[PDB]
Amino acid sequence: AKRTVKMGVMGRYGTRYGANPRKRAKKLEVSQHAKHFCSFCGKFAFRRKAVGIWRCDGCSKTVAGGAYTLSTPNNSTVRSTVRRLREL
Amino acid sequence: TKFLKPGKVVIVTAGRYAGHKAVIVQNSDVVTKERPYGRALLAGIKKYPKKVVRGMSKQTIARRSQVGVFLRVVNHKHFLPTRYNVDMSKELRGKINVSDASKRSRSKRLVRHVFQARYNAGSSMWFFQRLRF
Amino acid sequence: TMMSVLANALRTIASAERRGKRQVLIRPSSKVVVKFLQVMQKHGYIGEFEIIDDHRAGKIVVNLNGRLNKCGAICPRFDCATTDYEKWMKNILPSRQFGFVVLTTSLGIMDHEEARSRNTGGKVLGFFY
């Protein structure tokens, strides 16, 4: 059964940091503890090991990524921009 | 298709002779109870001839130019085929035997003599180059 | 989506009669539509009509003498006992002297006067006068 109604992983904090700071930290915590898709090896196995370090459980490849997500939107934009500048 | 021809140079990727170059003598794509895998009899370089430079005596050149040879049957998965070849005559392949111990030793001596002559003739020089890795 | 072929056919005939057309094309056709047309033709409210086969729901071309003031379908097909004929004549017919209510009886499709004479009830299909 469901154990909490609204707060998920933030239920560890009890009642003692405020609804909105908990809400803001919740999304980044859930992202940083989730399994992220690995473009190598095609598995959902990327886990964070310290801020900005992502290691895949499948192929054991370690990548430098974002603080709480594997790839930041800025990184995708920069990759596309650099590819386009290479093709020019 | 069917490139695993006798005479084709292969590189062994497994076992004690990993990285050593070998020549297919007899290919066996049919499985048996004793050997339930695709296999091939490999005549391979156990010891490549050493680099010899100008200014060394005939004796040391002869010592450094000796070729060591191994003759074993190896699973297909444990060597990597190449496009290089060493010509194996039909009679020469027919002489190589691994049935008995004495026949195995005689075949090893024959393969050693043939490879030494091949190295002396300056043919298949890639086959006598040691793989660096 | 067309739900009632009979209602569509009777609506098309009534429109053509209001406009004073000589012929009207009915599409699609059905056994019930042809049975209804034969009842009206029996009492003289329409002329000859022709059924055109097209290996589907066919078409009907009806010749119209100007005797048909109005024809229409009654939806849903309400059940009608032999005692309910006078109620339906009162509700939908212009008079007790002319006009017909068409019924689906187990004896076939017939006008209310014929059904009353056969002592049979059924479901009301429509009317014409």
């Binding site: 473009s39 190598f40 090896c41 095609g42 598995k43 | 298709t1 069917k2 490139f3 695993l4 794509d29 695709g38 297909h76 998965k77 990597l80 085929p81 496009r83 | -």
Partner: protein, 92 residues
């Protein structure tokens, strides 16, 4: 995609083998008719399979998707890096 239709047809009627090791086994024999490699494949493994295909004169196709996409296009619930069709099964 044409390759997706061809792969679906081979799954339907032809004979095929999945995985790099079984593909290499079919290449060592004279059985492979077409080899499909995902763009996800590790470069050294792809080079080895391509070398086998060149030695065996086997056609080689570079799939536009990754191993997950190749597995999905095969109708499978797992990922395949290399596909080897042994019988086209009237495909091509």
């Amino acid at each position: 995609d044409t390759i997706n239709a061809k792969l679906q047809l081979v799954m339907k009627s032809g004979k095929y083998v999945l995985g790099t090791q079984q593909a290499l086994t079919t290449l060592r024999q004279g059985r492979s008719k077409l080899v499909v490699i995902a763009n996800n494949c590790p470069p050294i493994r792809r080079a080895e399979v391509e070398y086998y295909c060149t030695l065996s004169k086997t056609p080689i196709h570079h799939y536009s998707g990754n191993n997950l996409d190749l597995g999905t296009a095969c109708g499978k619930h797992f990922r395949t890096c290399v596909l080897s069709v042994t019988n086209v099964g009237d495909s091509d």
